[PDB]
Amino acid sequence: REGKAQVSLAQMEYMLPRLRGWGESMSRQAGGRAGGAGGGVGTRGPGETKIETDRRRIRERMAKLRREIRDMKKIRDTQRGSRRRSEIPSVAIVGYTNAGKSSLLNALTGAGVLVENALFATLEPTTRRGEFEDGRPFVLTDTVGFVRHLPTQLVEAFRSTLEEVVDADLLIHVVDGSDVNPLAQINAVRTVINEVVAEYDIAPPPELLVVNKIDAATGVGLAQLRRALPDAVFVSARTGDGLDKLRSRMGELVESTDATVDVTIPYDRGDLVARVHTDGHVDATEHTDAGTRIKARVPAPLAATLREYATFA
Amino acid sequence: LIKLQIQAGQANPAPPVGPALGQHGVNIMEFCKAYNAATESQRGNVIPVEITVYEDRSFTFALKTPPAAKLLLKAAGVQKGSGEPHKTKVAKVTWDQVREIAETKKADLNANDIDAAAKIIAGTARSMGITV
Amino acid sequence: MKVNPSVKPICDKCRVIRRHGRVMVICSDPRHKQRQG
Amino acid sequence: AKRGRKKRDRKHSKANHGKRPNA
Amino acid sequence: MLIPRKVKHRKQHHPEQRGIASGGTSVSFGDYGIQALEHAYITNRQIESARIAINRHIKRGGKVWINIFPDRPLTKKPAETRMGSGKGSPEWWVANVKPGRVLFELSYPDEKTARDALTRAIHKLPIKARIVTREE
Amino acid sequence: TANIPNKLTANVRTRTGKGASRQARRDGKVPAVLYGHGTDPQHLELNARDFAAVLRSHGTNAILTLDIEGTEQLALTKALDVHPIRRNIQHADLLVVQR
Amino acid sequence: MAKADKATAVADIAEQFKASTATVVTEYRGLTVANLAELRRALGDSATYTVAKNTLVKRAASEAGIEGLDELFAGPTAIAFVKGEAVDAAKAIKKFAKDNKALVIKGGYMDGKALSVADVEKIADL
RNA sequence: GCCCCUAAGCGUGUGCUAAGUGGAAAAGGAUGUGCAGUCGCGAAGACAACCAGGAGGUUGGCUUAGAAGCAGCCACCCUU
Numbered sequence: 001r002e003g004k005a006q007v008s009l010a011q012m013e014y015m016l017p018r019l020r021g022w023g024e025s026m027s028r029q030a031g032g033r034a035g036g037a038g039g040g041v042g043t044r045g046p047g048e049t050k051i052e053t054d055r056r057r058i059r060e061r062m063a064k065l066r067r068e069i070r071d072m073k074k075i076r077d078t079q080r081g082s083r084r085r086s087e088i089p090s091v092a093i094v095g096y097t098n099a100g101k102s103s104l105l106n107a108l109t110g111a112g113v114l115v116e117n118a119l120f121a122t123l124e125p126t127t128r129r130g131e132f133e134d135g136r137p138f139v140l141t142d143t144v145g146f147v148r149h150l151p152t153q154l155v156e157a158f159r160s161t162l163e164e165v166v167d168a169d170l171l172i173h174v175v176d177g178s179d180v181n182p183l184a185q186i187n188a189v190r191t192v193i194n195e196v197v198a199e200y201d202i203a204p205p206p207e208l209l210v211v212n213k214i215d216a217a218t219g220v221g222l223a224q225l226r227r228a229l230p231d232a233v234f235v236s237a238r239t240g241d242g243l244d245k246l247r248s249r250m251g252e253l254v255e256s257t258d259a260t261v262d263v264t265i266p267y268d269r270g271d272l273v274a275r276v277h278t279d280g281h282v283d284a285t286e287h288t289d290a291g292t293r294i295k296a297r298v299p300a301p302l303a304a305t306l307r308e309y310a311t312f313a
Numbered sequence: 314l315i316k317l318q319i320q321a322g323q324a325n326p327a328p329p330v331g332p333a334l335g336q337h338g339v340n341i342m343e344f345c346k347a348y349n350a351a352t353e354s355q356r357g358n359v360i361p362v363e364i365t366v367y368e369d370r371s372f373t374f375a376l377k378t379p380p381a382a383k384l385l386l387k388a389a390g391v392q393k394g395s396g397e398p399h400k401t402k403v404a405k406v407t408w409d410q411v412r413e414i415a416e417t418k419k420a421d422l423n424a425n426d427i428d429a430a431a432k433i434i435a436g437t438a439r440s441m442g443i444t445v
Numbered sequence: 446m447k448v449n450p451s452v453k454p455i456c457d458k459c460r461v462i463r464r465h466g467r468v469m470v471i472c473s474d475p476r477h478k479q480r481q482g
Numbered sequence: 483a484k485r486g487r488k489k490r491d492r493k494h495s496k497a498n499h500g501k502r503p504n505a
Numbered sequence: 506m507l508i509p510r511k512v513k514h515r516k517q518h519h520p521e522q523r524g525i526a527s528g529g530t531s532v533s534f535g536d537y538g539i540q541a542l543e544h545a546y547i548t549n550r551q552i553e554s555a556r557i558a559i560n561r562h563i564k565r566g567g568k569v570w571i572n573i574f575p576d577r578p579l580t581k582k583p584a585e586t587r588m589g590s591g592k593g594s595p596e597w598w599v600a601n602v603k604p605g606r607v608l609f610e611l612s613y614p615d616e617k618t619a620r621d622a623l624t625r626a627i628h629k630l631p632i633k634a635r636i637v638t639r640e641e
Numbered sequence: 642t643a644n645i646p647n648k649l650t651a652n653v654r655t656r657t658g659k660g661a662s663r664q665a666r667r668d669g670k671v672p673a674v675l676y677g678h679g680t681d682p683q684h685l686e687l688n689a690r691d692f693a694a695v696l697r698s699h700g701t702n703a704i705l706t707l708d709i710e711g712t713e714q715l716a717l718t719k720a721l722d723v724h725p726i727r728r729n730i731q732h733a734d735l736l737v738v739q740r
Numbered sequence: 741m742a743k744a745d746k747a748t749a750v751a752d753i754a755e756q757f758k759a760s761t762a763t764v765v766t767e768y769r770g771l772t773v774a775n776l777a778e779l780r781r782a783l784g785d786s787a788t789y790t791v792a793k794n795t796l797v798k799r800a801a802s803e804a805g806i807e808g809l810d811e812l813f814a815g816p817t818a819i820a821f822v823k824g825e826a827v828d829a830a831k832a833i834k835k836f837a838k839d840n841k842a843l844v845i846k847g848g849y850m851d852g853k854a855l856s857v858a859d860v861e862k863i864a865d866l
Numbered sequence: 867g868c869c870c871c872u873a874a875g876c877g878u879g880u881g882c883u884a885a886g887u888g889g890a891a892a893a894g895g896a897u898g899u900g901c902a903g904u905c906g907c908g909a910a911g912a913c914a915a916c917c918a919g920g921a922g923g924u925u926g927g928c929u930u931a932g933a934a935g936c937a938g939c940c941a942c943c944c945u946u
């Protein structure tokens with residue numbers, strides 16, 4: 001419903017200025033093609049009426065859909081409140097239409113989001129679990145695909161993606177080297193990202209550039225044409241490869257909120273070390289049954305339970 | 314109290330005893346001495362012993378059948394190589410082979426008959442996917 | 446409380462009762478507490 | 483809605499036998 | 506969706522919603538079926554919704570038959586137009602469903618899953634409908 | 642191979658027709674016509690409950706011994722007219738089975 | 741009494757254990773599985789420790805084989821059916837039973853003719 | 867139509883309704899009624915039985931430092 005309402009509002013915003021000539025022409029049109037009886041819903045859709053091609057109906061429907069979109073913005077705020085309050089690292093997969101992205105999500109996680117070769121297959125951003133190599137949990141979210149000149153009427157359709165970008169912590173920028181001059185794709189996505197940054201007055205979050213479809217690439221460029229970027233990652237989700245490098249770069253770029261500790265939890269506690277393992281990233285734990293020295297990267301609340309058995313070194 | 318299966322060889326029963334004895338209150342040095350004095354020649358694979366916490370401290374032991382099902386993996390040298398037991402069956406030690414070791418380990422085995430103990434042991438071992 | 450025309454068990458713990466001439470769902474999980482109205 | 487509904491449903495009486503003018 | 510390749514007459518009189526179904530009243534293809542209990546113009550959109558509900562409930566296996574076909578065009582005149590000035594253009598494709606007509610049939614090994622899928626379909630449908638079975 | 646024919650009392654019909662059949666069904670008796678090679682269609686009323694029980698326990702191809710005022714006649718349920726909504730046996734066409 | 745199953749159990753308790761010399765019955769409550777296993781190992785020489793529904797075992801044994809005892813089927817009692825002993829192995833059911841409070845003995849149905857209060861207070865002494 | 871308004875029945879027999887339903891309307895839902903069927907009857911509950919055991923191999927195997935009957939996967943055996 002949210003996507004349908006956003007798209008209907010976008011179509012009505014586009015139709016309102018140009019309702020006279022093109023408006024009447026497409027009102028007459030009953031072939032059921034692009035725009036003409038195209039609808040605003042989906043399969044079958046409301047072609048018979050399309051964008052209502054009528055000043056009064058269009059304005060009324062626009063006002064209704066604006067109220068509804070305010071309601072859905074509130075609903076999404078409530079839905080994302082859990083993540084925002086957990087402060088869990090959020091990684092947004094931005095990029096041009098096609099160019100994996102949805103495939104990259106389904107690869108980095110176990111998800112099964114719609115992955116079609118058509119354009120604008122993903123209309124609603126979708127979040128999912130992710131585990132960095134060091135164990136730091138995070139939220140990887142696939143977003144809607146940008147184009148060269150996104151119509152200004154799709155502001156509400158892309159508001160979810162823009163909000164995910166605003167929250168963000170890594171901005172995995174997915175592009176494909178199997179296109180005509182992928183630098184143009186890079187530049188379009190970078191300009192939309194910069195516009196969002198200027199609008200929301202936030203520091204530009206990291207942008208991990210990743211290139212896929214390299215397996216299906218022509219390989220014409222040796223190291224400086226096909227990999228002209230100095231530190232862009234190359235993955236090609238389909239044939240499993242480079243994804244480990246992508247994960248490592250993700251973990252390195254995402255700054256940790258935990259604090260490294262050296263706590264010698266006794267063996268009479270048990271729970272205080274089991275929870276260190278559970279919420280925390282244990283490594284170099286001593287096997288001595290006497291006071292251990294667990295060099296884990298515990299979260300903030302656990303970092304305050306050190307004075308129990310912190311020792312000094 | 315707790316079965317607390319620990320290596321029969323007195324090598325380093327630190328993982329099991331430490332946290333277990335933690336809340337029990339039994340001191341590590343005394344328990345290590347008690348376990349060392351128990352497993353003098355009983356250097357098999359692994360023994361479960363019941364501490365039987367008394368009002369303050371007991372230091373009691375209860376050995377029943379150290380090897381149990383765990384003997385077949387170490388006899389066949391297969392180790393943790395049974396992902397889907399009964400499907401990816403490993404360690405093809407026949408029944409004519411396992412029966413002798415079963416009788417050897419037969420001390421209590423909750424069984425009054427050789428056939429009953431053999432059936433129990435076969436059922437226990439086959440849980441790890443064995444072709445007896 | 447979920448006040449909807451249709452109230453049904455949401456888990457195996459939920460029990461449908463009729464208290465005060467009103468169908469309700471009572472559960473150990475308060476989230477699944479429902480009422481017909 | 484209520485007015486029409488009542489005027490229409492009052493034909494469901496034993497005296498009217500399920501019919502009334504203007505339903 | 507279900508739309509006829511063509512219709513000899515595209516502006517037809519409304520199908521007469523009278524009498525019980527005289528044909529198609531038994532499960533002839535699958536093991537379970539959805540029998541209608543009231544008259545309704547079941548539209549192609551409703552048919553699509555019901556069949557998708559059944560297919561998504563049975564997931565992988567099973568077979569679904571859609572006995573009714575929405576080949577009757579119900580017309581609609583343009584909005585905010587007065588009475589007269591001809592008949593409206595075809596708007597909906599409906600199948601004239603009568604009580605006793607079996608609308609969908611399902612073959613699925615699991616009886617509970619089959620009945621739950623048919624219940625999904627019935628909830629999508631605009632009429633009272635029961636789950637009938639081949640076994641009489 | 643074969644089985645014991647199912648016993649059903651099938652009184653002849655004093656009155657026949659639409660009203661008679663509806664009244665018989667209301668009484669709880671499925672109307673039937675027994676015909677066959679004997680060339681003598683007889684108009685019977687089988688107890689609806691017993692007839693349906695026999696049909697659902699031994700199937701449509703279940704041989705029936707109809708007691709028609711004392712006389713026993715073997716017959717198989719050649720056809721069953723069943724209402725699609727009420728699911729009740731509207732009518733039975735029975736075919737004599739000489740042994 | 742569950743028909744087919746009760747009939748099979750009646751056969752089992754009639755033609756498999758009634759053929760004994762002494763029929764003892766112990767009221768058991770609070771006895772653990774390990775406790776009864778230990779006691780049975782102690783008395784492995786005699787008895788078989790067969791217990792079922794009291795009404796079932798009554799209607800089976802008191803009407804097909806043994807006679808003259810009914811009151812022994814109104815409580816949670818397990819029958820022993822001494823294998824070959826008479827009272828010699830009765831020590832394992834007397835002392836090792838009365839040391840545990842529970843497992844209260846009763847019976848002493850020697851040579852399958854007559855019943856008594858328990859007879860173990862007198863005859864099991866030997 | 868027949869308790870009073872309001873003429874004539876707080877009519878007779880049997881049963882149902884607890885909703886003032888009667889005295890307005892899908893889906894959801896009964897500890898309301900008869901009727902029928904199917905299990906258990908072993909006494910219009912049974913081995914879902916007020917008191918007892920509910921074990922043992924064993925902490926079954928993959929799993930990690932933890933998987934103990936119950937993060938997650940495999941089947942899930944025997945003894946008494």
Ligand SMILES: Nc1nc2c(ncn2[C@@H]2O[C@H](COP(=O)(O)OP(=O)(O)CP(=O)(O)O)[C@@H](O)[C@H]2O)c(=O)[nH]1
Pocket residue numbers: 096097098099100101102103104114115116117118119120121122123143144145146212213214215216235236237238239
């Ligand atoms: N050969 C190859 N194909 C790929 C690779 N990554 C994605 N694809 C293909 O490209 C198509 C792109 O679709 P998708 O993965 O959804 O990209 P997208 O960005 O989500 C499309 P949108 O942004 O509009 O939702 C997919 O059908 C997928 O099979 C790759 O690394 N190699």
